[PDB]
Amino acid sequence: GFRKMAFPSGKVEGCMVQVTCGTTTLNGLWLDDVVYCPRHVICTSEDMLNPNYEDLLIRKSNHNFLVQAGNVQLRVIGHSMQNCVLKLRVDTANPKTPKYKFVRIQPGQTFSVLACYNGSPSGVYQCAMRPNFTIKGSFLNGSCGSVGFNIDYDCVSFCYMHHMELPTGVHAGTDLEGNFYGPFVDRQTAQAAGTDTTITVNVLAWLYAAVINGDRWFLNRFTTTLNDFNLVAMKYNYEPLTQDHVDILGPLSAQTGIAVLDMCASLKELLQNGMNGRTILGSALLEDEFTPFDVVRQCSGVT
Amino acid sequence: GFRKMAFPSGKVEGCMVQVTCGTTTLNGLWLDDVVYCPRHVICTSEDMLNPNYEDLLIRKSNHNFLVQAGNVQLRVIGHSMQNCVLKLRVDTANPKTPKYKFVRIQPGQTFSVLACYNGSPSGVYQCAMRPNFTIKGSFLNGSCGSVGFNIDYDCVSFCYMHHMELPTGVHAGTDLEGNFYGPFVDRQTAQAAGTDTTITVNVLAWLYAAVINGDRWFLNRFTTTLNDFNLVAMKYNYEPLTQDHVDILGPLSAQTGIAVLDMCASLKELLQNGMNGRTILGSALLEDEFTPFDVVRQCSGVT
Numbered sequence: 156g157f158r159k160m161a162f163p164s165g166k167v168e169g170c171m172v173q174v175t176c177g178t179t180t181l182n183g184l185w186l187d188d189v190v191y192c193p194r195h196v197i198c199t200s201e202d203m204l205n206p207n208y209e210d211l212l213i214r215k216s217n218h219n220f221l222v223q224a225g226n227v228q229l230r231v232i233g234h235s236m237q238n239c240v241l242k243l244r245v246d247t248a249n250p251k252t253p254k255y256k257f258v259r260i261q262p263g264q265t266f267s268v269l270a271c272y273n274g275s276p277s278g279v280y281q282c283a284m285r286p287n288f289t290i291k292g293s294f295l296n297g298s299c300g301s302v303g304f305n306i307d308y309d310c311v312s313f314c315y316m317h318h319m320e321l322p323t324g325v326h327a328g329t330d331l332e333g334n335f336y337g338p339f340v341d342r343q344t345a346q347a348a349g350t351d352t353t354i355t356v357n358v359l360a361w362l363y364a365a366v367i368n369g370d371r372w373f374l375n376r377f378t379t380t381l382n383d384f385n386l387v388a389m390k391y392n393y394e395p396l397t398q399d400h401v402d403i404l405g406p407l408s409a410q411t412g413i414a415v416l417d418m419c420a421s422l423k424e425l426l427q428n429g430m431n432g433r434t435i436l437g438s439a440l441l442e443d444e445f446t447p448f449d450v451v452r453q454c455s456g457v458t
Numbered sequence: 459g460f461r462k463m464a465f466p467s468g469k470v471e472g473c474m475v476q477v478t479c480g481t482t483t484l485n486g487l488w489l490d491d492v493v494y495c496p497r498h499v500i501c502t503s504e505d506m507l508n509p510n511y512e513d514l515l516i517r518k519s520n521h522n523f524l525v526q527a528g529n530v531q532l533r534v535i536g537h538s539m540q541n542c543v544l545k546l547r548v549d550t551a552n553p554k555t556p557k558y559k560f561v562r563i564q565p566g567q568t569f570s571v572l573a574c575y576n577g578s579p580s581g582v583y584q585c586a587m588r589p590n591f592t593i594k595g596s597f598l599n600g601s602c603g604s605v606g607f608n609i610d611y612d613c614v615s616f617c618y619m620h621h622m623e624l625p626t627g628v629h630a631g632t633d634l635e636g637n638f639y640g641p642f643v644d645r646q647t648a649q650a651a652g653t654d655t656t657i658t659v660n661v662l663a664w665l666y667a668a669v670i671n672g673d674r675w676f677l678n679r680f681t682t683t684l685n686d687f688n689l690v691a692m693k694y695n696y697e698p699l700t701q702d703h704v705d706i707l708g709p710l711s712a713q714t715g716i717a718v719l720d721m722c723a724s725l726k727e728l729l730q731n732g733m734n735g736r737t738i739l740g741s742a743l744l745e746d747e748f749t750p751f752d753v754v755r756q757c758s759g760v761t
């Protein structure tokens with residue numbers, strides 16, 4: 156039953172446009188009279204290895220940028236570069252612009268992705284920012300410019316714009332001010348992502364979700380200290396658990412009656428012994444892309 | 459990377475309303491000047507065990523039905539029952555009504571669910587109709603009236619309206635003409651779902667998705683006949699594979715160069731030997747809630 160659940164996507168759907176520069180097409184985000192999109196739309200195959208974006212942008216004129224909203228052609232009024240995003244001024248403000256803000260999220264946090272091709276939404280799914288600042292998304296060629304977001308009542312918080320795939324199949328992108336998450340650059344070069352680690356506070360949230368849903372077998376009698384837990388966690392490539400994380404798990408602990416450090420003792424045994432062919436929430440691996448908030452809202456129905 | 463992916467939900471979001479009858483609140487679908495919702499909204503705790511819906515509806519008047527769209531109160535003009543759904547005539551046609559049709563889907567088919575509480579969308583996820591006509595959804599109390607749908611370009615095909623949870627945690631609902639999928643009834647009584655079986659054509663689609671994504675280890679040298687495959691499949695509670703299913707897998711077979719019956723031979727060995735602790739697409743179990751269409755569109759970017 157318990158599953159990855161995205162935010163309703165309607166407010167973002169009304170913002171997605173197609174941006175074509177030369178032979179290249181990708182997606183842009185139309186808020187008020189500005190369309191945001193990856194600046195690598197202005198590259199050519201002749202310049203992808205080490206483009207000089209300042210020079211490339213100089214050579215462009217407004218009319219080199221074809222922007223379409225549905226089947227409607229928006230005239231670009233001006234163009235500028237903010238870090239790795241291009242801001243295309245258009246002569247019409249998007250009448251479907253929602254209330255929004257730009258936010259830069261933290262590793263371990265989750266968001267919904269509205270995957271788009273040729274400016275048209277194709278699917279919505281929940282994703283997480285990995286500790287190494289990649290996202291393990293589902294993106295095909297031409298998905299660049301698709302955005303990740305969270306919704307707070309009426310307000311859309313945009314946190315990710317998709318830029319590229321790393322040759323290992325994971326994905327890299329920026330905040331909506333164009334700063335990459337992680338060490339990545341928007342050129343065709345060999346790029347290593349760091350070692351990825353497991354998001355411990357999220358695995359704990361998911362164990363609480365298991366308990367909430369009656370899956371309880373992994374619970375044991377014991378407790379542990381944060382330090383003692385963290386010693387084992389390091390050896391299994393788990394992120395350190397902080398007192399902040401303990402405090403963030405407070406609501407789930409209160410709902411189930413299981414102290415955070417008691418859940419930590421259960422996770423410690425699971426790491427040392429594996430699942431012996433049993434499953435938790437219909438899964439044979441420990442899931443780390445549900446936040447405590449994610450669990451709370453799917454198990455409490457936040458709208 | 460490969461994951462469950464829902465349709466963009468915007469067109470359905472504009473249709474969700476709150477319906478309150480007495481002390482009970484659930485969701486309704488506002489299309490043109492009609493709001494559709496589960497007829498069990500008219501029950502009371504005193505009548506839930508064996509309600510007489512004809513009599514209960516007789517006793518209701520238009521003003522017993524409180525319908526709200528956002529914070530706007532729609533006046534019910536008339537009320538009628540079509541099988542297990544109530545059709546509330548309201549004096550305003552929904553200006554956000556999309557192009558739509560009502561469809562009754564087949565076991566094994568998938569759809570997106572827009573989960574709603576108090577008439578407000580809370581999340582979107584992909585679901586499948588189980589062979590025993592349950593759906594393994596993520597629904598809390600008050601989610602009744604939430605709908606499942608597919609999108610064909612501009613047209614929303616509604617196929618499911620959520621009615622109730624069965625005490626085993628799976629869910630039961632109707633098409634949008636109010637006919638339950640499966641043997642279930644909308645009263646508080648002991649209700650068995652039949653034995654559930656694995657959707658073989660979907661497991662095959664998901665193995666093709668694995669191959670498309672470079673996960674190839676389970677491939678073997680052999681082929682098999684449909685009959686020979688089906689003999690083994692029965693013993694593992696797999697649905698029979700038909701020639702229609704073979705034909706439906708044609709596109710995926712053509713893309714990967716693996717004949718359908720060769721994939722069937724690989725699945726036959728996986729069933730008899732298990733995965734030996736290996737995973738396919740990051741999963742230690744065989745996934746059966748992706749259709750061949752689902753795979754094609756996520757691996758080809760249908761908008």
Ligand SMILES: CC(C)(C)c1ccc(N(C(=O)c2c[nH]cn2)[C@@H](C(=O)NC2CCCCC2)c2cccnc2)cc1
Binds near residue numbers: 180295299318321
């Ligand atoms: C110019 C630059 C920065 C090198 C670049 C080039 C191509 C793209 N990719 C576009 O699909 C695409 C479409 N329109 C423009 N680019 C894809 C992409 O990353 N390929 C490769 C680029 C470097 C080598 C490895 C990956 C892509 C595929 C799947 C999901 N997401 C994006 C992204 C950035």
Ligand SMILES: CC(C)(C)c1ccc(N(C(=O)c2c[nH]cn2)[C@@H](C(=O)NC2CCCCC2)c2cccnc2)cc1
Binds near residue numbers: 499621
């Ligand atoms: C009257 C009738 C048909 C017996 C009924 C009663 C309650 C509801 N449930 C409402 O939550 C709800 C909210 N408003 C009105 N009903 C829930 C539901 O099925 N409980 C039980 C009903 C019979 C015994 C087992 C389950 C529900 C929970 C989680 C997800 N989905 C629905 C559905 C149908």
